[PDB]
Amino acid sequence: SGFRKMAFPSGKVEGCMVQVTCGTTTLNGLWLDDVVYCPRHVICTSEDMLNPNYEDLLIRKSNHNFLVQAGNVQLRVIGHSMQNCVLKLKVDTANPKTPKYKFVRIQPGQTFSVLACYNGSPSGVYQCAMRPNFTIKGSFLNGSCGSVGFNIDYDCVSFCYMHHMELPTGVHAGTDLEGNFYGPFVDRQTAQAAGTDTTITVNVLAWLYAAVINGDRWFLNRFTTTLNDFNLVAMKYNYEPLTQDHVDILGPLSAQTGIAVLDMCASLKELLQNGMNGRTILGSALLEDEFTPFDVVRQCSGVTFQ
Amino acid sequence: SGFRKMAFPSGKVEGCMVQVTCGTTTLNGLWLDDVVYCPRHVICTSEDMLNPNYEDLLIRKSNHNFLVQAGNVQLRVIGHSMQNCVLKLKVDTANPKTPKYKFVRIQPGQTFSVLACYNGSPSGVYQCAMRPNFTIKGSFLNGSCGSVGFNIDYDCVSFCYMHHMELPTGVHAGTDLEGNFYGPFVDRQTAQAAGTDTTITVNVLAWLYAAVINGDRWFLNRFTTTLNDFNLVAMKYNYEPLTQDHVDILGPLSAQTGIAVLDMCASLKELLQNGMNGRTILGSALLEDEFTPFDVVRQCSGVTFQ
Ligand SMILES: *[C@H](O)[C@H](C[C@@H]1CCNC1=O)NC(=O)[C@H](CC1CCCCC1)NC(=O)[C@@H](NC(=O)OCC(F)(F)F)[C@@H](C)OC(C)(C)C
Ligand SMILES: *[C@H](O)[C@H](C[C@@H]1CCNC1=O)NC(=O)[C@H](CC1CCCCC1)NC(=O)[C@@H](NC(=O)OCC(F)(F)F)[C@@H](C)OC(C)(C)C
């Protein structure tokens, strides 16, 4: 028993982190096969940031402008290309520690692990969710750019995030590994703001199911509610609508606990309406929303990865 | 910015996990050099658990009773010895992925990462603290025994925990890597209970300093308080006494934020006295106590590990 915000083992991603240096900019890159992926603003300088034209900026660079440090070993760039907001630096050495891997663009509400890195050297690992507004509430300092987010499925690393920037509110924005920003953000230092975030309702429900599997039962009730009637109470409290597809995903957690999904929704309703009144759920005093249904099943049942 | 409950990168420990099987018991072991460490109750069976004599139980086993699975490779046990509550199975293969490593017995209040494992295969990584009552609020299912807790210091893995058992309250007990239980617990299925836990005050203070570094300032005040007067308010709310040694550890966090340690104690006092009144600190509605002063400095400043 117990329930922890749990990251995937990070050893497969640690083996891919490298330091990429160009001019006065140093950040992390991801080394898979003979290619290093990193944010394209690595080619910017201190006066390139206000409104850059990265095509113009990139035709001006040569391969020997890119210093790619892998441990105490310099990699040699032999070519470069830009796809959307990321550089691909082709290097002469294929990474022998290349895991099996995919690039995936995740939907909001989905979670992943972030291996935070500085100077190509992994510092820490934590769990995150894509917020409905396509930010992530990360922990990033300067030099953490090019750090990646990821899920692991059996033996395969699905890369889903690469870090570019902190917004003035202190949340973080970034791209998928093919370089497309999550959300409306560009990689240009301008006025930009997150957009009103909302709470991932389907995840809160999955976490309440986690609690029930782990002995917390005080918040349940006998009431039920229709899906329409739940979303009327949802939108007041700035929760996302629950779709019928959300209900079906929550099927196995309903089946294993014997609590119909619509009954857990009646629980959440009263929780939002009456507060928690000095009680806690899974050691938390707030309704947590960064566990997906995947996660709860993974952690409450025991799925590993080789 | 941001502040996350952050584990160390786990790749160095992942490379040491193995599956140890003996009779009907399968758990994880730790493979460093030519030795596999695992909990000694691996030699118990389903009727060996009520009150065992592990010396008697162990003189009865031969090396070929221990199946040591490392990936899809059987290791051969060539000898075995018991130190306190852990077996050391000597094997013919030295682990080539052996990190640099130490065994340390940590004080309560200290934190570490747990790489949760099943069948020798890492499943997840999370952060933990040794609770003042020598339990850990872990996330462990059946088969997670022999999973280890650890800190990383530069390039060296300080192993500090190995998992043995869940208590009826659902918290977890275990040994250091030299096999000495944390706390009064034995490895014998008996009536056993945790003992009244308390809140790690020095850690709560370090976390409030984290908040201040990250822009949360609402809980501060102009008041100060003496150390004695703080501990009078502490012991009511089941907090641990703050020692002068706790104050000095919190020095750099005092110096970097400009908030004298005794002034942050006056803040905590009013927080315990007046609640948080619907506000949150670092996205939390409870006073968090599983960041040490180390951690806050590590995460708010950027220390990595090669
Ligand atoms: C990468 O190492 C670095 C990490 C940042 C720094 C602090 N935590 C992080 O996540 N990334 C940057 O510093 C990034 C540079 C890059 C330059 C070309 C355009 C794309 C970004 N800049 C930022 O993260 C700044 N944010 C910002 O003002 O961008 C504009 C927008 F849209 F508002 F986000 C950071 C450094 O913000 C301030 C407020 C200046 C601290
Ligand atoms: C190792 O894989 C396994 C992990 C446990 C199971 C569920 N989560 C865990 O942390 N360890 C055990 O199951 C362990 C066996 C071992 C046998 C010889 C004596 C030392 C323990 N037993 C337990 O963790 C049980 N706890 C227990 O009752 O021990 C006595 C004490 F002191 F009360 F803790 C678990 C399985 O407890 C119950 C309540 C039966 C679920």
Q: Which residue has the tokens 């309440």?
A: A208
Closest CB from A10, A15, A215 relative to B10: A10
B41 an active-site residue? yes
Structure tokens at A29: 């890159």
Is there a contact between B125 and B141 (Cβ–Cβ < 8 Å)?
A: no
Chosen from A72, A114, A123 to mutate, greatest number of chain B CBs within 10 A? A123
Is there a contact between B183 and B272 (Cβ–Cβ < 8 Å)?
A: no
Q: B165: nearest CA in chain A?
A: A1
Whether residue A126 and residue B172 make contact (CB cut-off 8 A), yes or no, is: no
Deposited experimental method: X-ray
**What is the DSSP-derived secondary structure letter of residue A300?**
H
Number of other CB atoms surrounding residue A217 within 10 Å: 10
Number of other CB atoms surrounding residue B283 within 10 Å: 13
| CB-facing half-sphere around the CA of A46: CA atoms within 13 A | 1
* Residue nearest to ligand 2 atom 32, measured at CA: B192
A41 an active-site residue? yes
Write out chain B residues lying below 8 Å of A170, CB-based. Answer: 1-2, 214-215
* Pocket of ligand 1 from Cβ distances under 6 Å: A 27, 41, 44, 49, 140-145, 164-168, 172, 185, 187-190, 192
Q: B216: nearest CA in chain A?
A: A170
Is there a contact between B116 and B144 (Cβ–Cβ < 8 Å)?
A: yes
B66 Cβ below 6 A of ligand 2 = no
Is there a contact between B70 and B96 (Cβ–Cβ < 8 Å)?
A: no
From-to residues of CATH 1.10.1840.10 in chain B:
198-301
Task: Write the burial class of residue B290 (CB in 10 Å: 0-12 exposed, 13-18 middle, 19+ buried).
Answer: buried
Deposited resolution, Å? 2.0
Strand partners, B114: B126, B149
Between the CA of residue A106 and those of A14, A111, A160, A172, what are the distances in Å?
21, 8, 6, 16
Q: In sequence order, what are the residues at sequence separation of 6 or more whose Cβ sits closer than 8 angstroms to the Cβ of residue B244? A: B227
Give me the CATH topology for the region B15-99.
Answer: Thrombin, subunit H (2.40.10)
Write out chain B residues lying below 8 Å of A9, CB-based. Answer: 10-11, 14, 115, 122-125
Specify the DSSP element, H or E, that contains B217: none
Write out chain B residues lying below 8 Å of A306, CB-based. Answer: 71, 121
Give me the CATH topology for the region A198-301.
Answer: main proteinase (3clpro) structure, domain 3 (1.10.1840)
From-to residues of CATH 2.40.10.10 in chain A:
1-14+100-197, 15-99
Strand partners, B112: B128
Q: What Rg do the C-alpha atoms of chain A give, in angstroms?
A: 22
Class of domain A1-14+100-197: mainly beta
CA of A213 to the centre of ligand 2 (A): 18
- Provide DSSP, B180-200: PBSSS--SSSS--------B-
Is there a contact between B94 and B202 (Cβ–Cβ < 8 Å)?
A: no
Task: Write the burial class of residue A276 (CB in 10 Å: 0-12 exposed, 13-18 middle, 19+ buried).
Answer: middle
Q: Considering B22, B128, B145, B160, which one is annotated as catalytic?
A: B145
Cα–Cα distance, A5 to A295 (Å, whole number): 9
CA of B70 to the centre of ligand 1 (A): 44
- Nearest-neighbour CA in chain A from B55: distance (Å): 30
